[PDB]
Amino acid sequence: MSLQLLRNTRIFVSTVKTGHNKTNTQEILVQDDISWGQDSNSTDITVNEAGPRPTRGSKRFNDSLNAAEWSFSTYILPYKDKNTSKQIVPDYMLWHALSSGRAINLEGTTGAHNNATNFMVNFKDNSYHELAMLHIYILTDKTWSYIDSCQINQAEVNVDIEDIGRVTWSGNGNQLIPLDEQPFDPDQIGIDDETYMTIQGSYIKNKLTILKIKDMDTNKSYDIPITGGTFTINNNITYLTPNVMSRVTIPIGSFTGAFELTGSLTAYLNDKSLGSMELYKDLIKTLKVVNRFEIALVLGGEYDDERPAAILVAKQAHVNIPTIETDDVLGTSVEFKAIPSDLDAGDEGYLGFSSKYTRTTINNLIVNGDGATDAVTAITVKSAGNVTTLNRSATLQMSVEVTPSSARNKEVTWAITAGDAATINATGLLRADASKTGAVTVEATAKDGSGVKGTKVITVTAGG
Amino acid sequence: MSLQLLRNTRIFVSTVKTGHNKTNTQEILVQDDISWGQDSNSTDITVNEAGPRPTRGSKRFNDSLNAAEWSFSTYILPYKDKNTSKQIVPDYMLWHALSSGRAINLEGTTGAHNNATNFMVNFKDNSYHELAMLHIYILTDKTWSYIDSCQINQAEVNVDIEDIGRVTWSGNGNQLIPLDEQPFDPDQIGIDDETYMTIQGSYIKNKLTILKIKDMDTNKSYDIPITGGTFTINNNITYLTPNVMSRVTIPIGSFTGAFELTGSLTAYLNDKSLGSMELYKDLIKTLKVVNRFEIALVLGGEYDDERPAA
Amino acid sequence: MFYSLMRESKIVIEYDGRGYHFDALSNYDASTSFQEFKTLRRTIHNRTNYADSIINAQDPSSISLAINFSTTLIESNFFDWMGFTREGNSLFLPRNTPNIEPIMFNMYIINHNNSCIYFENCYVSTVDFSLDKSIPILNVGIESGKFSEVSTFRDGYTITQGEVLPYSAPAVYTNSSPLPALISASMSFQQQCSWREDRNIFDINKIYTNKRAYVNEMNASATLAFYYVKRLVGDKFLNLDPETRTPLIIKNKYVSITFPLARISKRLNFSDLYQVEYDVIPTADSDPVEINFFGERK
Amino acid sequence: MFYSLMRESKIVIEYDGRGYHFDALSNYDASTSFQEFKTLRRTIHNRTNYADSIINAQDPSSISLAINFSTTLIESNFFDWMGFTREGNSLFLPRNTPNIEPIMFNMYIINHNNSCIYFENCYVSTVDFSLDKSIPILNVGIESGKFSEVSTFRDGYTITQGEVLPYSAPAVYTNSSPLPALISASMSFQQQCSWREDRNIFDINKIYTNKRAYVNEMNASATLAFYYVKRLVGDKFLNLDPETRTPLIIKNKYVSITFPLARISKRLNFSDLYQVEYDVIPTADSDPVEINFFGERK
Amino acid sequence: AFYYVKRLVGDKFLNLDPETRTPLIIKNKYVSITFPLARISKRLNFSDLYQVEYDVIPTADSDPVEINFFGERK
Amino acid sequence: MSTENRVIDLVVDENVPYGLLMQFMDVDDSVYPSTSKPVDLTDFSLRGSIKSSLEDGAETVASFTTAIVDAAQGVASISLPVSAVTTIASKASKERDRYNPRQRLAGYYDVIITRTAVGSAASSFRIMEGKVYISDGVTQ
Amino acid sequence: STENRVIDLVVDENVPYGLLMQFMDVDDSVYPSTSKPVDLTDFSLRGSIKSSLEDGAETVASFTTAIVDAAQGVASISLPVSAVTTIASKASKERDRYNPRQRLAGYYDVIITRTAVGSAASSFRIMEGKVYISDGVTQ
């Protein structure tokens, strides 16, 4: 004899239906908009006669049950746990079941895997017809229930400024099953006060949102202050249910669709250099069937001191032709989609969550893929013995110095750009010949894709 | 380094892309609801396999650009100009491009042509696959832009009593082109204070709206006090865009559809002689496949002394 | 100039020197065409590319009219013209076809501004209507031999169809025992004539138009759709066995097609709700098939 | 691995040792297949269940391209390759077919990563475009004899189609008198060749590919759709009578197909608004049919 | 029905040539139809994404075609 | 009139020597049917190299050993020893492909046949091109 | 035809394994393909079972080659039950999708070899694939 209120609901995400412990189940902090259920299909058989005194009667049959629908919203709350000292988001298994179809392994390098610097999610291993399989456990007041064999259909993230960073999850399950007995003690599995304090120490505010967009075909970075946006991770999962005329049926298995990583970004038109107006004019002047943009949406902002942040990186993105949104202040919309280099390659994009992002950390996350792996920032090329010039028929094996000293990729390539008076090899052994009286240049760039420039103008002469 | 506000937009209507003067371009006084733009089409190519370890990847291609959409609302503001002493509406070339497909000639007798008494627009010469061709020039604050080769798709007029007489224009253009340099000095071409005073002297109030309806098959004039209404001039213009798989395409030409002049008129039921009730009862008693009515909607009212009217 | 709208038209059938303007016409469809003799004379001398085509005949036209039932019963003249014998307001299907050639009549399709298309040497070849839960309408099908464009015409000011008859639910009986669970009773009557092409060498360099035709057969048919209903286990009245001879009548408030003796074949469909379908034709020695036309109050 | 997208493709036609990359391609469709000889040798000894199927021939491919008109008029080469004689920018339909065999050419369908499909021994068998209220486009139809997969190919960097021509309303004339109320002018040109199968006993245990073909006929045709319009009562200019010989031209701002003498057959449809349909073919002794290709400014 | 996929330039495994005899099996978790020797004919369609279509029949001297029915756990 | 096929992709087997032999044959189409005579490879030498990329400055993975088997029959063999196969296997890309984990991309290769002599013109000719793949083996 | 070197071996737990390869040389010049068997002279086969293809992978086991009836071409590859147990020890705990008894144990390939039959070491790989252990119940 009791009424059940929605405010007392508690959600646990599990990968096992028995043997529930702290590594298989954790509570998911949900909000008011939580919803779940399961709909049923039916049919009416009616006789349609034409004569006088016709039969006017119907009949209903239950024929099938639809896939269970569930949805809830959670705050993006990166933090570091005391047990492992690795940055982790509380709803990490949700990210894993969204990202890959293999067993969860935070020590690995695919799907949801963490580190001493940041928590990372990449979609390099999502080529599966059935992604990682969860079981949502619902606790309303006293009664228990759960949805059997769920799959993460999508994860909506709305960049709504003057609001907190939040993600909305949606999915489907085979069947919603009400449980009379307690599966596991929610007091122990549920998050305790210490980790709650640690989490609430780190919040992501959508207002402090910087965006980094670069045209890979022209090497043009734009300065676009955002007004509002959203990006989605969608699986297009469809649940199959068998058709049996004699008995009602529930869905039996599913099949993932096409993985889509789209987005939409609204901003005001700026007349300044490399502003929104320049991007819009370039996009509507080129009129190209395909675009290669690098988009790095950085929720929570970038700062020298440690700040929480959630970052979406699209290496090779596709940007639609923008349109002007006539409001009281003129604006625009930059709708993009992260496409892979090859269809069966994955790597459409990745995400990095942490409560400790210095600007260098997010920079090397963007250019190297991991916040811990350092990346080169600047280069000044060095000759063989501090030499400033060269004469005809003389070698010059030039070297390189890089910063920082702990960058993972310390190598560079070699090229000649301005002038035709010398040639360089893979190692850097520049070679010249006679009849070389012009000023020639030499260049070097790193192999990690940082975008670092090494230049030197050597004054090659005809000799004494 | 500046933000652009919608309140500082100024719209000029032109028939030429060069040699802009006061007879080819005039400013059009627009309102808050002004809007313009151009949308683009795309496509996603997705592989749909069935086996285990299927390929889950998509790819987007820009394939075509849609026709540019523009719309704005203007007040019906008849007046007489000092230069020619003939009654003219400031957005007269809009009326011409709506009415006929020939070169503008106010001295003529078809399309938009004026007189020493009134400004008139008739649709006796609209049998053309491509009506008179305009170029909408948009000036927001400092930056310029324009829509290339526009056509007046329709003109909505809403008879909303206790409100001013207003007309809403809509249309399509081949492509929206942003201009970096000033095409013409907006200070000179834009309307000056004298003509602004002359215009604001004449306003059309939708409240003072008399309607004259007569059944041509019976010779019965009715006295119907209106409550609210609207009439449209529609061209049903469709813009054609070519389909090329290798390169994105913009519309290349258009073709006018069927010219429709419809309307809708709401009024209260009156038991008086020749009232709304009599018209309704006659119409539902005759039950005829075709009707011959003479309708003369007079915005601004009729008076012995001089008054503005549309 | 003058365009020609289908909605602004008037179809008048000219028979015996009187114009039968068939109002209450829901929709009609017609076409005109010519026959060509196109041969390509490719030779070893000249492998030509240009054909030798001459127009020498008018392809017979196939006009279809959809006519609503009316209170003045002008539409029964289509049964009258198609060959049925008349007694009062009831049309009999004769045991034998009366004449070799059908009853020929001309038809006009009037339009505004003295525009007209003149179909000549027409005969009614098909008449079928479905008694159902929608308003009944009989689609007649006539075939013409010669079509022409004329300035003045015949317009049936007086002979016209009245108001459409109100809907009334159909019911099929055996003697006086109703047949339960009716769905759609469709009746079909035909006069399957054939054109006798007599194009000869005296018509060379001239356009030939068909003029004479002969009746291959007349028939009356009906397809009845029911729901598979049984009242008893091993029922005798309602089953799937064929019925060699049984009196049937498809009755309405305004029309009643009577088969004095009928040959019924049944067909069961295992659909969402089981449906049986009859195939009713009159027997060999059956009395003439009746078609009564009741205007009002029977 | 490498998937093959239709949107990421390039079609290059190889003729005379030069590559004609046909850009401005709206859509193309093609298929490849093999011919089998599958017999089941069921005997009284062994009533077997397993057939004896051997692949011995390549079924000819049917490639269809839809190409937009362009300012450089590369698309007129399809008329040139199909057999028309050329003078300036106008293509004539010759009185007689010039040669027994058609003009053969190879075609590539390029894709990324050195992937290609090589159609050989192709000939243009159909070209038809509809001048209407939508942007004109000519659908060409070529038939191949042998298809193959090759690594390197021919890519038409220079010879390419320019910008698509802007839309312009069609108009059909008789001499210089316009024909009113045009709806859709559709033109059709064909080279109805036939493959000469020469599969012999020396090709046993080998895959056979068609190589040689002969031209059965060439023709130029057009179907014109109008609204039935008459200006006078008993008009002589506009009626339904056939016209043995009349000069016709279906003119546009960028193309004009001319019939010096035409054989017109008319067909009237009693639709919502009456429509007449022409069937225009050149006469026996008519001068060659003209097809002019105006890029810009005629 | 497959998608036209090639892994190499001038690949030998995946192409359009007919295969007189090749062992094929269309396998599932609950059923497996086996052709000990198969006669495969290929057909390429230049659709939105290129698709190849096989036509698998057993050869003349092929062993009997298998159809296994696994209820659960094979 | 037909096309050539200069682009050929090679697949080597790890821990196994790779041997490819090319035959150059003279051809002609005349009144008499296709007459083919082997090309006499005298003063004809080959040379091939493999790099991990097409772009300039690419690391040289290895180089092929060239030899002429039979001049009269016009047969030349282009191959590499097992140690070179191991060297290329070490330098190959670590990215695997599902449905066949064996194959990995190794780089691009070219082959030039040249005839160098005092009276001979300084003429080279790129006979082939393409990419080199590796079938990883477990034995050895 | 083409190439079919990739075939997967399913070895049984607690049972010794032995495979019998009838080497053959079919030629399809004549319509009834020639059934000539290759003659096994100066031939040795070598095969190791190694988990994963990455360099430095531990050698799970090694095949034991047997050459018998050289005239008619047949040959045998086998390994003792102790080798089977060593293979089954290191097999992964994840089971195959189609059969819940098999577990991936590693990769393999056998390499034929001619040792100076004509002063040439003409060694090439015969077959390849994955080795699957099938869990037994008897022991």
DSSP letter string over chain B? Answer: --B-BGGGEEEEEES-SSS--TTTEEEE---TT-EEE--EEEEE------SSS------EEEEEEPPEEEEEEEE---EE-TTT-SEE-TTHHHHHHHH-SSPP-TTSSSEEE-BSS--EEE-TT---SS---EEEEEEETTEEEEEEEEEEEEEEEEE-SSSB-EEEEEEEESEEEEESS-SS-HHHHS--HHHHHHHHT---BTTS-EEEEEETTTTEEE---EEEEEEEEE---EE-----SSS-B----EE----EEEEEEEE----STTSHHHHHHHHHHH--S---EEEEEETT---SS-----
> Cβ contacts (< 8 Å) between C183 and chain A: which residues?
48-50
Residue pair D277/D265 in contact by the 8 Å Cβ criterion:
no
> Best mutation site among B5, B6, B55, B58 for testing chain A: the one with the most A CBs within 10 Å?
B58
Which one-letter DSSP state was computed for residue D52? E
**Cα distance between residue B71 and residue B33, in whole Å:** 8
**DSSP letter string, D243-257:** EEEEEEEEE-SSEEE
Residue C220: which H helix or E strand, with range?
A: strand C213-227
Q: What is the 3-state secondary structure (H, E, C) of chain G?
A: CCCCCECCEEEECCCCEEEEEECCEEECCCCCCEEECCCCCCECCEEEEECCCCCCCCEEEECEEECCCCCCCEEEEEECHHHHHHHHHHCCCCECCCCCCEEEEEEEEEEECEECCCCCECCEEEEEEEEEEECCCCC
CB–CB of A245/A43 below 8 Å? no
CA D144/CA D106 separation, integer angstroms = 8
Find, among C179, C78, C163, C69, the residue nearest to C122 by Cα. C78
Enclosing H/E stretch for D162: none
Which tokens in the block code for residue C101? 């050639």
- Say whether the F–D interface has 3 or more Cβ pairs within 8 Å: yes
Nearest beta carbon to residue F5 from set D1, D120, D152? D152
Alpha carbon dihedral C239, C244, C245, C250, in 10-degree steps, equals: 60
- Asked if the Cβ–Cβ distance from E8 to F100 is below 8 Å, we say no
Cα distance between the two ends of chain A: 106
Instruction: Answer whether E3 sits within 8 Å of B45, measured CB to CB.
Output: no
Among the listed residues D234, D264, D235, D269, the one whose alpha carbon sits nearest the alpha carbon of residue C61 = D269
Q: Hey, are the CB atoms on D285 and C3 less than 8 Å from each other?
A: no
β-partners of residue B68 are B173
Chains G and C, touching by 3 or more CB pairs within 8 angstroms: no
- Neighbouring chains of C at 3+ CB pairs under 8 Å are A, D
Q: How far, in Å, CA of A31 to CA of A167, rounded?
A: 11
Determine the residue of chain E that is closest to D57 in CA distance: E18
Cβ atoms A269, B3 nearer than 8 A: yes
Bridge partners of residue A298, in order along the sequence: A210, A311
Indicate which technique resolved this structure. cryo-EM
- Whether C181 sits inside 8 A of A47 (CB atoms) is yes
The answer to whether D103 contacts chain B (CB < 8 Å) is no
3-state SS record for F76-95: EEEEECHHHHHHHHHCCCCC
Instruction: With beta carbons less than 8 A apart as the criterion, state whether G100 and E73 touch.
Output: yes
D5–chain E Cβ distance below 8 A for any pair: yes
The strand pair at B134-140 and B120-122 is best described as unpaired
Cβ distance B56 to A287 less than 8 Å, yes or no, reads no
Tell me, yes or no, if E17 comes closer than 8 A to chain B by beta carbon.
Answer: no
Classified as helix, coil or strand, B194 is helix
| Cβ–Cβ under 8 Å, residues G136 and G88 | no
Q: A342 vs chain D: nearest CA distance in angstroms?
A: 8
Q: F92: Cβ–Cβ under 8 A, 6 or more apart, which residues?
A: F104, F105, F106, F107, F134
Select the residue from D152, D154, D202 to test the F interface by mutation, using most F Cβ atoms within 10 A: D152
Torsion angles phi and psi, residue B252, rounded to 5: -125, 90
Give yes or no for E29 touching B (CB within 8 A): no
Mutate to test the interface with F, among D1, D114, D115, D153 (most CBs of F within 10 A): D114
Please count the residue pairs, one from chain B and one from chain E, whose beta carbons lie less than 8 angstroms apart: 5
H/E segment holding residue C131? strand C115-131
Give CA B130 to chain center in angstroms: 16
Q: Is A360 helix (H, G, I), strand (E, B) or coil?
A: helix
For chain G, say whether E42 makes contact (Cβ under 8 Å).
no
Contact E49 B49 (CB under 8 A): no
Of G1, G4, G98, the CB nearest to E74: G98
> Chain C: nearest CA to A248, how far in angstroms?
18
**Closest-approach residue (CA) in chain A for F51:** A426
Note whether E49 contacts B47, CB cutoff 8 Å: yes
Those residues whose C-beta lies under 8 Å from the C-beta of residue G123, and which sit 6 or more positions away, are: F16, F17, G111, G112, G113, G114
Backbone angles phi, psi at B6, to 5 degrees: -70, -25
E interface test, pick of F3, F4, F6, F11 with most E CB neighbours within 10 Å: F11
Considering only CB atoms, D274 lies closest to which of C4, C50, C54, namely C4
Query: D187 burial class (0-12, 13-18, 19+ CB within 10 angstroms)?
Result: buried
Kindly tell me the burial class for residue G114, based on how many C-beta atoms sit within 10 Å of its own C-beta (0-12, 13-18, 19 or more). middle
Pair A31, A74: CB distance under 8 Å: yes
Going by C-alpha positions, the residue among B142, B150, B163 that lies closest to residue B209 is B163
What is d(CA B46, CA B36) in angstroms, rounded to the nearest whole number?
33
Helices of type H across A158-275: 186-189, 193-200
**Which chain D residues are within 8 Å of C28, Cβ to Cβ?**
270
Q: Could you tell me if F129 and F110 are in contact, meaning their C-beta atoms sit under 8 angstroms apart?
A: yes
B-chain residues near A340 (CB < 8 A): 57
In which region does residue C171 sit, left (phi positive, over 0), alpha (psi from -120 to 50) or beta (all else)?
A: beta
Residue F24 and residue F74 in contact, taking contact as beta carbons nearer than 8 Å: yes
Q: Do F66 and F21 form a contact (C-beta atoms < 8 A)?
A: no
For residue A92, what is the DSSP state? H
- Closest residue in E to F9 (Cα–Cα): E9
The Cα–Cα gap between B259 and D226 comes to 20
Chains that touch A (3 or more CB pairs under 8 A): B, C, D, F
Main-chain dihedrals φ then ψ at residue C155, nearest 5 degrees: -125, 120
Q: What are phi and psi of B32, to 5 degrees?
A: -60, -40
F94 touches chain A (CB under 8 A): no
Q: Are A143 and A177 in contact (CB under 8 A)?
A: no
**What span, in angstroms and rounded, lies between the C-alpha atoms of A297 and A301?**
9
Chain E and chain F share a number of CB contacts under 8 A equal to 17
